[PDB]
């Protein structure tokens, strides 16, 4: 497939097929003027319609008046749409502007402090996010660079993260990706095909309390560093006991195949799968949509690598919070550290050509 | 997803078609034992033969003794070779160790200071490098991680650079990629099929004065920050005048097609193409093989963006140095800053299964 439709009851980039690459950006708002911000949301929506179809923004990247800057910065000319999706979300800090304080959803809860948190304030929070997913990373970067340019004077970029999953040209669609610890990652997840499970666990409903959010969802982002060089010194048995699945096949202990249902009593009590499973958490179930990262090496020569964890849910209080609380004693905690965090309310979809991002909130 | 052959008279990853992704690492040596360093070069060569064919290193990623760490870290299981190449180079600082002082090639020149340089010493230099290029970033990270692990106690990573997309071409028959300024980059390079031009401008020859380097090359690496706020407010005419080519087609000024030959006298006297062209530099010609990068935000509300510039040449003194000296008046200097630098001697190819990286030096 080459393009993903932009219009719908829901924003694309949640339940639509998982693309190979991510560019995730958090923005802070610099204007106090509600009218100026609405004008920007309409201009951004018009740009997103062009970008997700493989077209340049505005009048184009070349062929305009020579004495004017081009409307599009030009680095995606000649590339394909690449399944680009652009998903916008609103942080709790936006609701302190524009008279919105009584329209913050109760489901957009502030996260508690969790044991072992080491959060960098500069790579946490944000008034707004745009999640750009595509199979070509230059298509994703071009989208973020041009939205930031259109918004200059009204928004600034607070923090940015590049990520990667599978490379689809060489890797079959059905094959579970491996994370940078070398384990299969995504076996037991909500799939975009499971319409009733998305209604139960992912999409906000009208009766949940906040009518503007009907058909939206709630996003938790966590930048999780892995202690790669410590993990690589652990024995094979220590690594498998941390998860409760074997490394080669990814089967649950005492089973033969990856997709065999787990028997939780055969795993160690503090194994990651046993603690995270819905049966250990009162039925709490998440849509995981995260990406691996490798940013470089730190000052000590260690690899700056890990998982940029993204979870979508109907209510932060009944999805991420109870599951992450249950990981207080996870055997995996020896090898990871949460170093960035943010939460966002992801509004409903853009219904047609005349609609715009945030129209249910702003009017 | 196909394999690139590892053995040859030359190392792969130079004339080879340019792959989508880069992971570049520079290492410093921490052992004084020559025999221990030779043992590492042989173990690294054996690992490279496995990794470039899509196999796990050593005894594999699982199914060994439960109480031992796996020989391979496992995150490339089930992936194709993805055109992985692994290219090793030796920095000038290596030749102060192991009694190698008299074997440093004359062509491995230290670079002069250039006007506008702001070089970070921590992300410059290095005793040696490994260039990993592949179409899958996970395959490239797995290769660098496993080499670093094998080298524990003998080498440490000094600095690394990931490139998310290529800004170079050795295949003129395929689409030329764009850099983050929005211009095609790679039109007039050296192609992998141009055997005469590779022998003249890229490969070191026995007669050049350093027999152990015959069939090798010399690498310059420059980390270049781009002033994208400043560039994005420039007019279309300003952008095109900086280069001497139009933005949409990438043709030389006045001409209709990308690959039409430049007419230099129609360009501004400070245009990048006019100053960099071989005819402006006594014939000096380079093989360019760079990649784009973005390392987050700059903490001032903007995306960080740059180009990791890589050039291969027969002699640094006759390749990169004269061309970069001629760029002192380039219109492009308003929009870039060099912030990292390193040079390396890239030895000849691994001839067969009994040969090893660096065997002609050691
Ligand atoms: C670097 C951090 C992490 C790594 C490497 C990791 C790895 C894994 C692996 C290998 C599995 C098993 C295969 C699968 O079903 O996907 C798994 C399952 C799971 N993980 Fe994690 N995980 C991490 C962080 C988290 C966090 C922060 C949460 C939630 C707060 C979470 C929730 C889950 C859930 C819900 C499952 C599925 C359990 C089931 O229903 O069987 N993980 N994870
Ligand atoms: C961020 C930095 C740079 C950018 C954005 C850039 C961009 C370009 C562009 C757009 C072209 C024209 C198309 C092509 O033939 O490749 C070009 C050509 C060229 N560049 Fe650069 N360049 C940069 C740095 C450098 C450096 C540092 C050198 C060498 C010291 C260099 C050497 C060349 C050469 C030799 C040509 C081909 C000229 C010819 O024979 O026609 N460039 N560059």
CSV table of C-alpha atoms in Angstrom, one decimal, chain A:
chain,number,residue,atom,x,y,z
A,1,UNK,CA,0.0,0.0,0.0
A,2,UNK,CA,1.2,3.6,-0.9
A,3,UNK,CA,-1.1,6.1,1.0
A,4,UNK,CA,-3.4,6.1,4.1
A,5,UNK,CA,-6.6,8.2,3.9
A,6,UNK,CA,-6.4,11.4,6.1
A,7,UNK,CA,-10.2,11.9,6.7
A,8,UNK,CA,-12.3,9.7,9.0
A,9,UNK,CA,-14.3,9.5,12.2
A,10,UNK,CA,-10.8,8.8,13.9
A,11,UNK,CA,-7.4,10.3,13.2
A,12,UNK,CA,-5.1,7.9,11.2
A,13,UNK,CA,-1.9,6.7,12.8
A,14,UNK,CA,-3.6,4.8,15.7
A,15,UNK,CA,-5.5,1.7,14.3
A,16,UNK,CA,-4.0,2.0,10.8
A,17,UNK,CA,-1.1,-0.3,9.8
A,18,UNK,CA,2.2,0.3,11.6
A,19,UNK,CA,4.8,2.1,9.3
A,20,UNK,CA,8.6,1.5,9.4
A,21,UNK,CA,9.7,5.0,10.8
A,22,UNK,CA,8.7,7.7,13.3
A,23,UNK,CA,9.4,11.4,13.8
A,24,UNK,CA,7.6,12.5,17.0
A,25,UNK,CA,7.7,16.2,18.0
A,26,UNK,CA,6.3,18.1,21.0
A,27,UNK,CA,5.6,21.8,20.6
A,28,UNK,CA,5.0,24.7,23.1
A,29,UNK,CA,2.6,27.5,22.2
A,30,UNK,CA,3.9,31.1,22.3
A,31,UNK,CA,0.7,33.0,21.5
A,32,UNK,CA,-2.0,34.1,23.9
A,33,UNK,CA,-4.5,34.8,21.1
A,34,UNK,CA,-7.2,32.1,20.7
A,35,UNK,CA,-8.1,33.4,17.1
A,36,UNK,CA,-4.4,33.2,16.0
A,37,UNK,CA,-4.1,29.6,17.3
A,38,UNK,CA,-7.4,28.5,15.5
A,39,UNK,CA,-6.0,30.1,12.3
A,40,UNK,CA,-2.8,28.0,12.7
A,41,UNK,CA,-4.8,24.7,13.3
A,42,UNK,CA,-6.7,25.4,9.9
A,43,UNK,CA,-3.4,26.1,8.1
A,44,UNK,CA,-1.8,23.0,9.6
A,45,UNK,CA,-4.8,20.9,8.5
A,46,UNK,CA,-4.5,22.2,4.9
A,47,UNK,CA,-0.8,21.3,4.9
A,48,UNK,CA,-1.4,17.8,6.4
A,49,UNK,CA,-3.9,17.1,3.5
A,50,UNK,CA,-1.1,17.9,1.0
A,51,UNK,CA,1.7,16.1,2.9
A,52,UNK,CA,-0.2,12.7,3.4
A,53,UNK,CA,-1.0,12.6,-0.4
A,54,UNK,CA,2.7,13.2,-1.4
A,55,UNK,CA,2.2,16.8,-2.5
A,56,UNK,CA,4.2,19.9,-1.5
A,57,UNK,CA,2.7,22.5,1.0
A,58,UNK,CA,1.1,25.7,-0.3
A,59,UNK,CA,2.2,26.9,-3.9
A,60,UNK,CA,5.0,24.3,-3.9
A,61,UNK,CA,8.9,23.9,-3.5
A,62,UNK,CA,9.9,25.7,-6.8
A,63,UNK,CA,8.4,27.7,-9.7
A,64,UNK,CA,7.0,30.6,-7.7
A,65,UNK,CA,8.2,34.3,-7.6
A,66,UNK,CA,12.0,34.2,-7.5
A,67,UNK,CA,12.2,36.9,-4.8
A,68,UNK,CA,10.0,34.9,-2.3
A,69,UNK,CA,11.0,32.0,-0.1
A,70,UNK,CA,9.4,28.8,-1.4
A,71,UNK,CA,6.3,27.6,0.5
A,72,UNK,CA,7.7,24.0,0.8
A,73,UNK,CA,11.3,23.4,1.8
A,74,UNK,CA,11.7,20.8,-1.0
A,75,UNK,CA,13.6,17.8,0.6
A,76,UNK,CA,10.6,15.3,-0.2
A,77,UNK,CA,10.4,16.1,-4.0
A,78,UNK,CA,10.6,12.9,-5.9
A,79,UNK,CA,9.6,10.7,-2.9
A,80,UNK,CA,6.3,8.7,-2.5
A,81,UNK,CA,3.6,9.3,0.1
A,82,UNK,CA,5.2,6.4,2.0
A,83,UNK,CA,2.0,5.7,4.1
A,84,UNK,CA,2.5,9.0,5.9
A,85,UNK,CA,0.1,9.7,8.8
A,86,UNK,CA,0.0,12.9,10.9
A,87,UNK,CA,-1.7,12.6,14.3
A,88,UNK,CA,-2.1,15.7,16.6
A,89,UNK,CA,-2.6,15.7,20.4
A,90,UNK,CA,-3.2,18.3,23.1
A,91,UNK,CA,-1.2,18.3,26.4
A,92,UNK,CA,-2.6,19.2,29.8
A,93,UNK,CA,-0.7,22.5,29.7
A,94,UNK,CA,-2.6,23.7,26.6
A,95,UNK,CA,-5.8,23.9,28.8
A,96,UNK,CA,-4.3,26.7,30.9
A,97,UNK,CA,-4.5,29.0,27.7
A,98,UNK,CA,-7.4,30.3,25.7
A,99,UNK,CA,-10.0,30.0,28.6
A,100,UNK,CA,-10.0,26.1,28.2
A,101,UNK,CA,-9.5,25.1,31.8
A,102,UNK,CA,-13.1,23.6,32.3
A,103,UNK,CA,-12.8,21.6,29.0
A,104,UNK,CA,-9.7,19.5,30.2
A,105,UNK,CA,-10.9,15.8,30.1
A,106,UNK,CA,-10.8,14.0,33.5
A,107,UNK,CA,-9.3,11.0,31.5
A,108,UNK,CA,-6.3,13.3,30.7
A,109,UNK,CA,-4.8,12.6,34.1
A,110,UNK,CA,-1.3,13.7,35.3
A,111,UNK,CA,0.9,10.6,35.8
A,112,UNK,CA,2.2,9.9,39.3
A,113,UNK,CA,5.9,9.6,40.0
A,114,UNK,CA,6.9,5.9,39.6
A,115,UNK,CA,9.8,4.2,41.3
A,116,UNK,CA,13.1,4.6,39.4
A,117,UNK,CA,11.8,7.6,37.2
A,118,UNK,CA,14.7,9.8,36.1
A,119,UNK,CA,12.8,12.2,33.9
A,120,UNK,CA,14.6,15.0,31.9
A,121,UNK,CA,12.3,18.1,32.1
A,122,UNK,CA,13.6,19.3,28.7
A,123,UNK,CA,12.5,16.0,27.0
A,124,UNK,CA,9.2,15.8,28.9
A,125,UNK,CA,5.8,17.5,28.5
A,126,UNK,CA,4.6,19.9,25.8
A,127,UNK,CA,1.5,21.8,24.9
A,128,UNK,CA,0.9,19.9,21.6
A,129,UNK,CA,2.4,16.8,19.8
A,130,UNK,CA,2.5,15.7,16.1
A,131,UNK,CA,3.2,12.0,15.6
A,132,UNK,CA,4.6,11.6,11.9
A,133,UNK,CA,4.8,7.9,10.8
A,134,UNK,CA,6.0,6.8,7.4
A,135,UNK,CA,8.1,4.1,5.6
A,136,UNK,CA,10.7,6.7,4.5
A,137,UNK,CA,12.2,8.7,7.3
A,138,UNK,CA,12.9,11.7,5.0
A,139,UNK,CA,9.1,11.9,4.4
A,140,UNK,CA,8.5,12.1,8.2
A,141,UNK,CA,11.2,14.6,8.9
A,142,UNK,CA,10.0,16.9,5.9
A,143,UNK,CA,6.5,16.9,7.4
A,144,UNK,CA,7.7,18.0,10.9
A,145,UNK,CA,10.2,20.6,9.5
A,146,UNK,CA,7.4,22.2,7.3
A,147,UNK,CA,4.7,22.2,10.1
A,148,UNK,CA,7.3,23.9,12.4
A,149,UNK,CA,8.1,26.5,9.7
A,150,UNK,CA,4.4,27.3,9.1
A,151,UNK,CA,3.9,27.7,12.9
A,152,UNK,CA,7.0,29.9,13.5
A,153,UNK,CA,6.0,32.8,15.7
A,154,UNK,CA,3.0,30.9,17.3
A,155,UNK,CA,4.7,27.6,18.3
A,156,UNK,CA,8.3,26.3,19.0
A,157,UNK,CA,9.7,22.7,19.0
A,158,UNK,CA,10.2,21.6,22.6
A,159,UNK,CA,11.7,18.1,21.9
A,160,UNK,CA,12.0,15.7,18.9
A,161,UNK,CA,12.5,11.9,18.7
A,162,UNK,CA,13.4,9.7,15.6
A,163,UNK,CA,12.5,6.0,15.8
A,164,UNK,CA,12.5,2.8,13.7
A,165,UNK,CA,10.6,-0.5,13.6
A,166,UNK,CA,10.9,-3.1,10.8
A,167,UNK,CA,12.1,-2.4,7.2
A,168,UNK,CA,9.0,-3.6,5.1
A,169,UNK,CA,10.9,-3.9,1.8
A,170,UNK,CA,13.0,-6.8,3.3
A,171,UNK,CA,10.9,-8.1,6.3
A,172,UNK,CA,7.4,-9.9,6.0
A,173,UNK,CA,4.4,-8.0,7.3
A,174,UNK,CA,3.3,-10.9,9.6
A,175,UNK,CA,6.8,-11.3,11.3
A,176,UNK,CA,6.8,-9.8,14.9
A,177,UNK,CA,9.6,-7.1,15.1
A,178,UNK,CA,12.4,-7.6,17.7
A,179,UNK,CA,13.3,-4.8,20.2
A,180,UNK,CA,17.0,-3.9,20.9
A,181,UNK,CA,17.2,-6.5,23.7
A,182,UNK,CA,16.7,-9.1,20.9
A,183,UNK,CA,13.2,-10.3,22.0
A,184,UNK,CA,10.1,-10.3,19.8
A,185,UNK,CA,7.9,-7.3,20.8
A,186,UNK,CA,4.2,-7.0,20.1
A,187,UNK,CA,2.9,-10.6,20.2
A,188,UNK,CA,-0.1,-9.9,22.6
A,189,UNK,CA,-1.4,-6.4,21.6
A,190,UNK,CA,-4.6,-4.9,20.3
A,191,UNK,CA,-4.6,-5.1,16.5
A,192,UNK,CA,-6.2,-2.5,14.2
A,193,UNK,CA,-8.5,-5.3,12.8
A,194,UNK,CA,-10.2,-5.8,16.3
A,195,UNK,CA,-13.0,-3.2,16.0
A,196,UNK,CA,-14.8,-4.3,19.3
A,197,UNK,CA,-11.6,-4.3,21.4
A,198,UNK,CA,-10.8,-0.8,20.0
A,199,UNK,CA,-14.3,0.4,21.1
A,200,UNK,CA,-13.8,-1.2,24.6
A,201,UNK,CA,-10.2,-0.1,25.3
A,202,UNK,CA,-9.0,2.7,22.9
A,203,UNK,CA,-11.7,5.1,21.7
A,204,UNK,CA,-13.3,7.7,24.0
A,205,UNK,CA,-17.1,7.4,24.1
A,206,UNK,CA,-19.7,10.2,24.5
A,207,UNK,CA,-20.9,8.8,27.8
A,208,UNK,CA,-17.4,8.8,29.2
A,209,UNK,CA,-17.9,12.5,30.3
A,210,UNK,CA,-16.2,14.8,27.7
A,211,UNK,CA,-18.3,15.1,24.5
A,212,UNK,CA,-15.7,17.0,22.4
A,213,UNK,CA,-13.3,13.9,22.7
A,214,UNK,CA,-15.9,11.3,21.3
A,215,UNK,CA,-13.9,9.2,18.8
A,216,UNK,CA,-10.5,10.5,20.1
A,217,UNK,CA,-8.0,8.6,22.4
A,218,UNK,CA,-5.4,9.3,25.1
A,219,UNK,CA,-1.6,8.9,24.4
A,220,UNK,CA,1.2,8.2,26.9
A,221,UNK,CA,4.8,8.7,25.6
A,222,UNK,CA,7.8,7.3,27.6
A,223,UNK,CA,11.4,7.6,26.4
A,224,UNK,CA,13.0,4.4,28.0
A,225,UNK,CA,16.8,4.0,27.8
A,226,UNK,CA,18.2,0.5,27.9
A,227,UNK,CA,21.4,-0.4,29.7
A,228,UNK,CA,22.7,-2.2,26.6
A,229,UNK,CA,26.2,-3.2,27.8
A,230,UNK,CA,24.9,-4.6,31.1
A,231,UNK,CA,22.1,-6.6,29.4
A,232,UNK,CA,24.6,-8.1,26.9
A,233,UNK,CA,26.7,-9.5,29.9
A,234,UNK,CA,23.6,-11.3,31.3
A,235,UNK,CA,23.3,-15.1,30.7
A,236,UNK,CA,20.7,-16.4,28.2
A,237,UNK,CA,18.7,-17.9,31.2
A,238,UNK,CA,18.7,-14.6,33.1
A,239,UNK,CA,17.4,-12.8,29.9
A,240,UNK,CA,14.5,-15.4,29.3
A,241,UNK,CA,13.6,-15.3,33.1
A,242,UNK,CA,13.2,-11.5,33.0
A,243,UNK,CA,10.4,-11.8,30.3
A,244,UNK,CA,8.8,-15.2,30.8
A,245,UNK,CA,9.3,-16.1,27.0
A,246,UNK,CA,12.3,-17.7,25.3
A,247,UNK,CA,14.6,-15.6,23.1
A,248,UNK,CA,14.6,-17.7,19.8
A,249,UNK,CA,10.9,-18.4,19.2
A,250,UNK,CA,9.4,-16.0,21.8
A,251,UNK,CA,7.1,-18.7,23.2
A,252,UNK,CA,5.8,-18.5,26.8
A,253,UNK,CA,7.7,-20.8,29.2
A,254,UNK,CA,6.5,-24.4,28.9
A,255,UNK,CA,4.9,-23.8,25.5
A,256,UNK,CA,6.2,-24.4,21.9
A,257,UNK,CA,5.0,-21.5,19.7
A,258,UNK,CA,5.2,-17.6,19.8
A,259,UNK,CA,1.3,-17.3,19.7
A,260,UNK,CA,0.6,-20.0,22.3
A,261,UNK,CA,-1.4,-18.3,25.2
A,262,UNK,CA,0.7,-17.9,28.3
A,263,UNK,CA,0.4,-19.9,31.5
A,264,UNK,CA,1.3,-17.2,34.0
A,265,UNK,CA,2.0,-19.5,37.0
A,266,UNK,CA,5.0,-21.1,35.1
A,267,UNK,CA,6.7,-17.7,34.9
A,268,UNK,CA,8.7,-16.1,37.8
A,269,UNK,CA,6.5,-13.8,40.0
A,270,UNK,CA,8.4,-10.6,38.8
A,271,UNK,CA,8.7,-11.6,35.1
A,272,UNK,CA,7.7,-8.7,32.8
A,273,UNK,CA,4.9,-10.6,30.9
A,274,UNK,CA,3.3,-11.9,34.2
A,275,UNK,CA,3.2,-8.4,35.7
A,276,UNK,CA,1.9,-6.6,32.5
A,277,UNK,CA,-0.8,-9.2,31.4
A,278,UNK,CA,-4.4,-8.0,31.7
A,279,UNK,CA,-5.3,-10.9,34.0
A,280,UNK,CA,-2.8,-9.4,36.6
A,281,UNK,CA,-4.3,-5.9,36.2
A,282,UNK,CA,-8.1,-6.3,36.5
A,283,UNK,CA,-8.6,-6.6,32.7
A,284,UNK,CA,-6.6,-3.4,31.9
A,285,UNK,CA,-5.5,-3.7,28.1
A,286,UNK,CA,-3.4,-1.2,26.0
A,287,UNK,CA,-2.7,-0.5,22.3
A,288,UNK,CA,1.2,-0.4,22.1
A,289,UNK,CA,2.5,1.5,19.1
A,290,UNK,CA,6.2,2.2,20.1
A,291,UNK,CA,9.4,2.4,18.1
A,292,UNK,CA,13.1,1.6,18.8
A,293,UNK,CA,15.7,4.5,19.0
A,294,UNK,CA,19.4,4.7,18.7
A,295,UNK,CA,20.6,8.3,19.1
A,296,UNK,CA,24.4,7.8,19.3
A,297,UNK,CA,26.9,7.2,22.2
A,298,UNK,CA,27.0,9.1,25.5
A,299,UNK,CA,30.1,10.6,27.2
A,300,UNK,CA,31.2,7.2,28.7
A,301,UNK,CA,31.1,5.5,25.2
A,302,UNK,CA,27.8,3.7,26.0
A,303,UNK,CA,25.1,3.2,23.3
A,304,UNK,CA,22.2,5.8,23.8
A,305,UNK,CA,19.4,3.4,22.7
A,306,UNK,CA,16.1,2.1,23.8
A,307,UNK,CA,12.3,2.1,23.3
A,308,UNK,CA,10.2,5.2,22.6
A,309,UNK,CA,7.1,3.7,24.2
A,310,UNK,CA,3.7,4.9,22.9
A,311,UNK,CA,0.4,3.6,24.3
A,312,UNK,CA,-3.2,4.6,23.3
A,313,UNK,CA,-6.1,4.0,25.6
A,314,UNK,CA,-9.8,5.1,26.4
A,315,UNK,CA,-8.7,6.5,29.8
A,316,UNK,CA,-5.2,7.0,31.2
A,317,UNK,CA,-6.5,6.1,34.8
A,318,UNK,CA,-7.6,2.6,33.6
A,319,UNK,CA,-4.9,1.8,31.0
A,320,UNK,CA,-1.3,2.9,31.5
A,321,UNK,CA,-1.4,3.9,35.2
A,322,UNK,CA,-2.5,0.5,36.7
A,323,UNK,CA,-0.2,-1.5,34.4
A,324,UNK,CA,2.9,0.7,35.0
A,325,UNK,CA,2.1,0.7,38.8
A,326,UNK,CA,2.2,-3.2,38.6
A,327,UNK,CA,5.8,-3.0,37.1
A,328,UNK,CA,7.2,-1.6,40.4
A,329,UNK,CA,9.0,-5.0,41.0
A,330,UNK,CA,9.6,-6.0,37.3
A,331,UNK,CA,12.9,-8.0,36.8
A,332,UNK,CA,13.3,-5.7,33.7
A,333,UNK,CA,13.9,-2.6,36.0
A,334,UNK,CA,17.6,-3.6,36.4
A,335,UNK,CA,18.2,-2.9,32.6
A,336,UNK,CA,16.0,0.1,31.8
A,337,UNK,CA,15.4,3.7,33.0
A,338,UNK,CA,12.4,6.0,32.1
A,339,UNK,CA,14.0,9.4,31.1
A,340,UNK,CA,11.2,11.2,29.4
A,341,UNK,CA,7.4,11.4,29.7
A,342,UNK,CA,4.3,13.2,28.3
A,343,UNK,CA,0.5,12.7,28.0
A,344,UNK,CA,-1.8,14.0,25.3
A,345,UNK,CA,-5.6,14.0,24.4
A,346,UNK,CA,-5.8,13.0,20.7
A,347,UNK,CA,-9.0,14.5,19.3
A,348,UNK,CA,-11.5,12.9,16.9
A,349,UNK,CA,-10.8,12.6,13.1
A,350,UNK,CA,-11.1,15.3,10.4
A,351,UNK,CA,-14.5,14.3,8.9
A,352,UNK,CA,-14.2,15.9,5.4
A,353,UNK,CA,-12.5,18.7,3.3
A,354,UNK,CA,-14.1,21.5,5.3
A,355,UNK,CA,-13.2,20.2,8.8
A,356,UNK,CA,-10.0,21.0,10.8
A,357,UNK,CA,-7.8,19.6,13.7
A,358,UNK,CA,-9.4,20.6,17.0
A,359,UNK,CA,-12.8,21.8,15.6
A,360,UNK,CA,-14.8,19.9,18.3
A,361,UNK,CA,-12.8,21.7,21.1
A,362,UNK,CA,-12.5,25.3,19.6
A,363,UNK,CA,-15.9,25.3,17.7
